[PDB]
């Protein structure tokens, strides 16, 4: 026998940084995959928060809003919040099967700064302009790298795949009930130069439940990936934009990708991509994962056009939008909470993403499994995982900014359609 320190919360010192590599990133988090050898972190990624350079856990109204869970609102810092929110809110609605909720790790302000320097190269100019890494969390989250187990993993950020029916949408905003917000949004994204090409994808095809509308969706995506489609080869990008959105696939990158699916997809040159896509579509349609998700999203029972009102009650500030419908203000404050919390929850579900791993059975290391795909026209069997990512809680305050963003979306669409 020998004597060792008692147990202690691991801490990531200013030396472990060179173990991590740039993965991707959103508006809210950094993500780096693991390159070092320590068994603990192998097959893991670190999700490190950043700070918009114009910047306690929960505001007073957010405490009351999420109060139905004492452990949640009493979160020290945002990693526990992130943990408890997936743990006691999301998985109840979503099921633990396709979420792999996260583990905290302490980190030194020095470690962060080291990662911050190490990625800036791989990061997109305007992401560097808009946010460095937030070097005053003590913590960060470690997750299973949902592109591992050759392993081909594809990521789909579906967005909201239903159309509202609220009695509070106005005649003028009548389009909102027949055009997905995603399509209209695209117009506003084009005017602001954030894409080059209106995207072929319509999340209605994905959330339709038609094994045939879904393949169109997956076909659309590969065509115009923007920032909703990504395909990896063992932790590397091969289709999609890294940390950002990317222009329509071209003849040159489709012929590059194509010659990449070599030896994973077994089909003659110029046939693998149409195969790979059938595979993705069938993983998505077969796993049924996309269904329960669209149930969460539909906790938007009133659309932001009606929900904003309940928001102004919550924060007990007189309602701007009204102009002298009591109906929504005459609610008991308790009911007005439920709509806004269910709104926020729904927001988590429209902004989340799906990762799908693959292990071809044409490789001898094949650990079979009851979730798999048999791709009829090449005779290959593929075992696959489907997991969620970016189930972050959203701030009560984005409500106001949500309403404004909606207004501009349906105002601007109405516009370009009046032209004709």
Ligand X SMILES: O=P(O)(O)O[C@H]1[C@H](OP(=O)(O)O)[C@H](OP(=O)(O)O)[C@@H](OP(=O)(O)O)[C@H](OP(=O)(O)O)[C@H]1OP(=O)(O)O
State the minimum distance, in angstroms, from the CB of residue 336 to Zn ion: 11
Q: Does 305 bind Zn ion (CB under 5 A)?
A: no
Q: How far apart are CA 17 and CA 110, in angstroms?
A: 9
Beta bridge partners of 22: 32
- Closest residue to ligand X, Cβ-based? 27
Among 12, 22, 26, 47, binds ligand X (CB under 6 A): 26
| Interacting residue with ligand X among 28, 99, 103, 175 (CB under 6 A) | 28
Q: Which two tokens stand for residue 82?
A: 């992130």
Interrupted after residues, the chain (C–N over 2.5 Å): 55, 149, 324
**Residue 348 contacts which entry, Mg ion, ligand ADP, ligand X, none (Cβ below 5-8 A, type-dependent):** none
Which letter, b or e, does each residue of 98-119 get, where b requires 16 or more Cβ atoms within 10 Å of its Cβ? Answer: bbebbebbbbbeebbebbbebb
| CA–CA separation, 74 and 419 (whole Å) | 52
Q: How far is the CB of 94 from Mg ion (least distance, A)?
A: 16
**Rounded Cα–Cα distance for residues 38 and 19 (Å):** 9
Q: Is 376 exposed, middle or buried (0-12, 13-18, 19+ CB in 10 A)?
A: exposed
Strand locations in 28-138, DSSP E?
Answer: 29-34, 44-52, 103-107, 131-133
Choose the binding region for ligand ADP from 64-72, 87-95, 387-395, 403-411 (rule: CB under 6 A). Answer: 387-395
For ligand X, the binding residues in 241-300 under the rule CB under 6 A are: none
Pairing of strands 372-375, 380-383: antiparallel
Check residue 143 for interaction with ligand ADP (CB under 6 A). yes
* Three-state secondary structure string covering 146-201: CCCCCEEEEEECCCCCCCCCCCCCCCCCHHHHCCCHHHHHHHHHHHCCCCCCCCCC
Q: Kindly indicate which of the ranges 18-26, 166-174, 176-184, 397-405 contains the residues binding Mg ion, using the contact rule CB under 5 A.
A: 18-26
Among residue numbers 396 through 415, which ones bind ligand X (CB under 6 A)? 405
Does residue 26 bind Mg ion (CB under 5 A)? yes
CB-based contact 225:239 (threshold 8 Å): yes
The answer to whether 313 touches 331, Cβ cutoff 8 Å, is: yes
Nearest approach, Cβ of residue 89 and ligand ADP (Å)? 17
Residues 223-242 binding ligand X (CB under 6 A) are: 227
146 binds, among Mg ion, Zn ion, ligand ADP, none (CB under 5 to 8 A by kind): ligand ADP
Closer residue to ligand X, CB minimum distance, 240 or 306:
240
Query: Which of 352/373 has CB closer to Mg ion?
Result: 352
For 211, the token pair is 């094994």
Interface stretch with Mg ion, choices 24-32, 34-42, 86-94, 129-137 (CB under 5 A): 24-32
- Residue 27 as a binder of ligand ADP (CB under 6 A): the answer is yes
- Pick the piece of the chain touching ligand X (CB under 6 A) from 22-30, 140-148, 161-169, 213-221: 22-30
Is 319 a binding residue for Zn ion by CB under 5 A? The answer is yes
Regarding 309 and contact with Zn ion (CB under 5 A), the answer is yes
Q: Which residues of this protein are in contact with Mg ion, per CB under 5 A?
A: 26, 28, 390, 392
Q: Which residues of this protein are in contact with ligand X, per CB under 6 A?
A: 26-28, 159, 227, 347, 351, 394, 405
Q: Which residues of this protein are in contact with ligand ADP, per CB under 6 A?
A: 23-29, 31, 45, 47, 143-147, 155, 230, 353, 355, 389-390, 392
């Amino acid at each position: 026998e020998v004597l060792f320190q008692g147990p202690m919360e691991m801490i990531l010192e200013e030396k472990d940084a060179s173990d991590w590599i740039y993965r991707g990133e959103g508006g809210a988090n950094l993500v780096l995959a693991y390159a070092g050898s320590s068994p603990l972190f192998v097959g893991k990624v670190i999700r490190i928060q950043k700070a918009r350079r114009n910047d306690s856990v929960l505001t007073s109204d957010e405490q009351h809003l999420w109060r139905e869970n004492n452990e949640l609102i009493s979160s020290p810092n945002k990693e526990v919040l992130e943990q408890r929110y997936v743990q006691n809110v999301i998985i109840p609605l979503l099921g633990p099967k396709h979420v792999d909720a996260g583990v905290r790790v302490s980190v030194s302000k020095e470690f962060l700064e080291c990662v911050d320097k190490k990625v800036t190269k791989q990061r997109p100019l305007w992401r560097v302009n808009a946010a460095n890494v937030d070097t005053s969390h003590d913590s960060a989250l470690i997750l299973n790298d949902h592109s591992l187990f050759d392993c081909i993993s594809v990521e789909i950020k579906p967005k909201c795949g239903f159309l509202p029916t609220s009695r509070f949408i106005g005649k003028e905003n009548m389009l909102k009930t027949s055009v997905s917000r995603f399509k209209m949004h695209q117009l506003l994204k084009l005017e602001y130069i954030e894409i080059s090409e209106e995207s072929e994808y319509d999340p209605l095809d994905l959330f339709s439940g038609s094994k045939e509308r879904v393949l169109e969706a997956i076909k659309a995506l590969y065509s115009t990936p923007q920032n909703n489609f990504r395909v990896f080869l063992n932790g590397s990008l091969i289709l999609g934009g890294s940390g950002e959105s990317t222009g329509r696939t071209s003849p040159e990158i489709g012929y590059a990708f194509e010659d990449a699916l070599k030896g994973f997809i077994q089909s003659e040159d110029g046939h693998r991509t149409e195969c790979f896509l059938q595979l993705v579509s069938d993983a998505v349609y077969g796993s049924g994962v996309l269904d329960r998700l669209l149930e969460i999203q539909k906790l938007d029972k009133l659309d932001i056009e009606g929900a904003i009102h309940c928001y102004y009650d919550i924060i007990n500030q007189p309602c701007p939008i009204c102009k002298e419908e009591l109906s929504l203000h005459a609610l008991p404050l308790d009911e007005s909470l439920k709509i806004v919390k269910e709104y926020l929850i729904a927001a988590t579900a429209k902004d989340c993403s799906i990762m799908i791993s693959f292990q071809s059975r044409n490789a001898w290391d094949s650990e079979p499994s009851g979730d798999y795909v048999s791709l009829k026209p090449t005779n290959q069997t593929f075992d696959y995982k489907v997991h969620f990512i970016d189930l972050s809680l959203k701030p009560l305050k984005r409500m106001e900014s949500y309403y404004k963003l909606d207004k501009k979306i349906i105002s601007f669409y109405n516009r370009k359609q009046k032209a004709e």
